[PDB]
Design a protein around this nucleic acid. Structure first.
Ligand SMILES: [Mg+2]
Ligand SMILES: [Mg+2]
Ligand SMILES: [Mg+2]
Ligand SMILES: [Mg+2]
Ligand SMILES: [Mg+2]
Ligand SMILES: [Mg+2]
Ligand SMILES: [Mg+2]
Ligand SMILES: [Mg+2]
Lengths: 54, 117, 84, 136, 178
RNA sequence: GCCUGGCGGCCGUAGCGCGGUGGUCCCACCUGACCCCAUGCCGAACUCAGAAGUGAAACGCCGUAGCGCCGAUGGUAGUGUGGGGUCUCCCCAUGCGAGAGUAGGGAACUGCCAGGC
RNA sequence: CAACCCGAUGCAAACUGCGAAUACCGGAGAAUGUUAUCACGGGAGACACACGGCGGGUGCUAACGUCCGUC
RNA sequence: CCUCCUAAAGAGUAACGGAGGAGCACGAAGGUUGGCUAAUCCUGGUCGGACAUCAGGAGGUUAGUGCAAUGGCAUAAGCCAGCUUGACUGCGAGCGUGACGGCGCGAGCAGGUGCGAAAGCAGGUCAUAGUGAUCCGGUGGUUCUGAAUGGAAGGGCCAUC
């Protein structure tokens, strides 16, 4: 589980707004890159590059 | 087609009868020569209809030559205007197989002054 | 972490399966009909299957919602009591 | 046919208790050994029943006895009772009152098969419908 | 074009009389062919033999399929996923092409030639060709061959039955032995 | 009313098999292909423009009980209540009463609308 | 010398192309029973049960055995 | 904790009863749209001599489901590709299941999304295991509070470890 090798936790984040949204990922599998949409405090979606940006 | 099978996505939407129920369809047909159409209440009232090529209309054999967006369109026009009642009631035209060209010209031929989506 | 010993003495602590909501009740947007748990759409159930099949609820309020997929997928139509 | 209490090929479970009811059969060959009186063959019996069904006359004639086991048992040594149950090694076929033995060959069989009945677990008449209109 | 005409023009009517039906539709037609090479490298299918389709491609003039694999674990070290094929089929006009380019050009390419296998009809009509190598259908610089794992090819036809066939193929086929 | 097309009700007394059969009204196969559109290869499928040809396949009909299927009546198995033997099984009063098998049935029947006489 | 397919015969808690009794669920109806029903609140005790019948695991269809169900 | 039998055809019910699985995985293995259907054998086919890609035929859950077992699956949830981020935020009619803590199902509503011509589908995976209450704290957000007052520390609230 909490093996520093397999699945970890993805804090994730958005671009200006101070949101959160969390999920899981890996390590060996291609990483050091991420970004989806998700809905912030309010309004539109967009950005949410989270940690590990392209 | 239907020969080799029926067990294909072709029936997936035809079961619009559930939930949508009242949702009426157009069916539309291919058959190289004609196109057909007809509109009936879902399943609760097949006792409804529209019109295919309906030969008699202006002349006797529905004097029309072609089958492209030209003939295909009118192929619908009749069901459309003749079924003025049903339009706002939101029908639906069911691809049957594919939504391109012939059936497109047939479907869109209705979208103009008819079937409010 | 050895709790391995077969013995074959081991439960499941089963739940939810039950055929609750038997027959055509007075109605209500109650569950009635669940079996395998998951479930999705359903609406005024009509009891379906195949070959034999096709239960006939006939009575409900306006949206039973229940039956997953092991028992007559979806349902509802025009049936209420007088009409729908 | 044979018994060797040949295992049902292998394992696939080995439990269940017991329970008997009513017989379910007629005939196949010529002479028969109706069961009657509930019980259960020790399986090892079928071996004894057959081993005795041929002493004077050669293996001549088609002996076909038709009842098939499938019924592990299991017992316990001189121990308490952890209620598990060790191996089976017994195999007691369920026999309510069917009736099965066949001696495809013209003859007196009665005094022949009864020569092996005492080996059986309980009483069992003979009866032999050489043929068939009993049941369509 | 080339040969497809020999059909109606001097091939249909032979069958219309011999065997003797009444419909120029029931006249035995030629569906397609489908070539395809086979044996792939259990392990080596990569650079080795990817130029294997390069040949079957232009040999037909289309785009190979290279195919895949439907076999799991048991004895052959492959796990249902590798290419190891070619396929390539022709039913179009280009089908008669490869025909007018078989019977005429190189049906007779090997020193061990003598005709076509009499007894190789699929049981209901079609015939599976084979042969092992060489190009037989030159259109290469020819100073590069890597004995590219042969050719199968199996002309599919609407032939009703085994013997019902033969007489069909046996009507342009200048090569077939005797 | 005869036949054909879409769309349903019913889902095997509606299916499978085998045999015969219908034609440019339909349907089909079919003619053709630079495309709109399509092939992890192919106009095979989908797609589109439509001579000529044929009902060969498909399809729909109709015949035919080889194979499915439907199936009583009676008997049997079980079983609720009430009792009685008796070893774990069984009996009787009583009410429900199968599965299998048997006679027989059987080659579906129907509705909305559109096109040929 | 034998899997595989055809005919004839069995077996199954973890087989089912069939299928009861029946218990349970909801709907009306007459009659009967000093609301027997439900809710909220004061006081509880009570969680060692034993035997007999029926259905069963176990155990040997052993046990004034043992563990469930039900009366 | 999850699956099946026991478990007497509604739930449920035991034993140191008979068999197994979990303490995950997945930028896709999710969403949608469009499309496609097994396994196995027979006859043929070069590189075969049991099975390799091809051709037709018999081709009928006997296939495949990410991992147990049960149930389910062709409208496929099984398989492939394009486009994407609904693995959304705020609520929720009414239900199921629990002594309780709690757990599960959920149409519909509001804001903004993706896929589709469109009806429409999407609030993570075919469903059922993959889990840890409280306290003490850590990190970010907010003028909720802040002991004379203005701040601040600290406390709350929301998100999360
Ligand atoms: Mg206690
Ligand atoms: Mg106690
Ligand atoms: Mg007790
Ligand atoms: Mg006691
Ligand atoms: Mg139960
Ligand atoms: Mg019960
Ligand atoms: Mg071979
Ligand atoms: Mg799953």
């Amino acid at each position: 589980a909490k093996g520093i090798r397999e699945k970890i936790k993805l804090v994730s984040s958005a671009g200006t707004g101070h949101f959160y949204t969390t999920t899981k990922n890996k390590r060996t599998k291609p990483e050091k890159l991420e970004l989806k949409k998700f809905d912030p405090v309010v309004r539109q979606h967009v950005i949410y590059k989270e940690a590990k940006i392209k | 087609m239907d020969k080799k099978s029926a067990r294909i996505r072709r029936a997936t939407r035809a079961r619009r009868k559930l939930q949508e129920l009242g949702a009426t369809r157009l069916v539309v047909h291919r058959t190289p020569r004609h196109i057909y159409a007809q509109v009936i209440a879902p399943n609760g009232s097949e006792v409804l209809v529209a019109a295919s090529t309906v030969e008699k209309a202006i002349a006797e054999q529905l004097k029309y030559t072609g089958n492209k967006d030209a003939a295909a369109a009118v192929g619908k026009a009749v069901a459309e205007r003749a079924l003025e009642k049903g339009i706002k009631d939101v029908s639906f035209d069911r691809s049957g197989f594919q939504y391109h060209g012939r059936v497109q010209a047939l479907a869109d031929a209705a979208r103009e002054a008819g079937l409010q989506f | 972490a050895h709790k391995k010993a077969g013995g074959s003495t081991r439960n499941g602590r089963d739940s939810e399966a039950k055929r609750l909501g038997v027959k055509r009740f007075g109605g209500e947007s109650v569950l009635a009909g669940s079996i395998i748990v998951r479930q999705r759409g359903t609406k005024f159930h009509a009891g379906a299957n195949v070959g034999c099949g096709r239960d006939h609820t006939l009575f409900a309020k306006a949206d039973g919602k229940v039956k997953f997929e092991v028992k007559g997928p979806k349902n509802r139509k025009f049936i209420s009591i007088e009409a729908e | 046919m044979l018994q060797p209490k040949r295992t049902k090929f292998r394992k696939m479970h080995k439990g269940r208790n017991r329970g008997l009811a009513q017989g379910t059969d007629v005939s196949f060959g010529s002479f028969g050994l109706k069961a009657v009186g509930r019980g259960r063959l020790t399986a090892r019996q079928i071996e004894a029943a057959r081993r005795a069904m041929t002493r004077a006359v050669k293996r001549q004639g088609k002996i076909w006895i038709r009842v098939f086991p499938d019924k592990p048992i299991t017992e316990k040594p001189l121990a308490v009772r952890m209620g598990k149950g060790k191996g089976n090694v017994e195999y007691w076929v369920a026999l309510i009152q069917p009736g099965k033995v066949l001696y495809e060959m013209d003859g007196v069989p009665e005094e022949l098969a009864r020569e092996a009945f005492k080996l059986a677990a309980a009483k069992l008449p003979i009866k032999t419908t050489f043929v068939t209109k009993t049941v369509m | 074009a080339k040969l497809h005409d020999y059909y109606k023009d001097e091939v249909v009517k032979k069958l219309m009389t011999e065997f003797n039906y009444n419909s120029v539709m029931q006249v035995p037609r030629v569906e397609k062919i489908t070539l395809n090479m086979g044996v792939g490298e259990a392990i080596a299918d990569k650079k080795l033999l990817d130029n294997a389709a390069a040949d079957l491609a232009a040999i037909s003039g289309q785009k190979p399929l290279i195919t895949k694999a439907r076999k799991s674990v048991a004895g052959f070290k492959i796990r249902q996923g590798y290419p190891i094929g070619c396929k390539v089929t022709l039913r179009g006009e280009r089908m008669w092409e490869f025909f007018e380019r078989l019977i005429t050009i190189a049906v007779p390419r090997i020193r061990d030639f003598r005709g076509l296998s009499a007894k190789s009809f699929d049981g209901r009509g079609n015939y599976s060709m084979g042969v092992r190598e060489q190009i037989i259908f030159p259109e290469i610089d020819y100073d590069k061959v890597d004995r590219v794992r042969g050719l199968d090819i199996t002309i599919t036809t609407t032939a009703k039955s085994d013997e019902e066939g033969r007489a069909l193929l046996a009507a342009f086929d200048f090569p077939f032995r005797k």
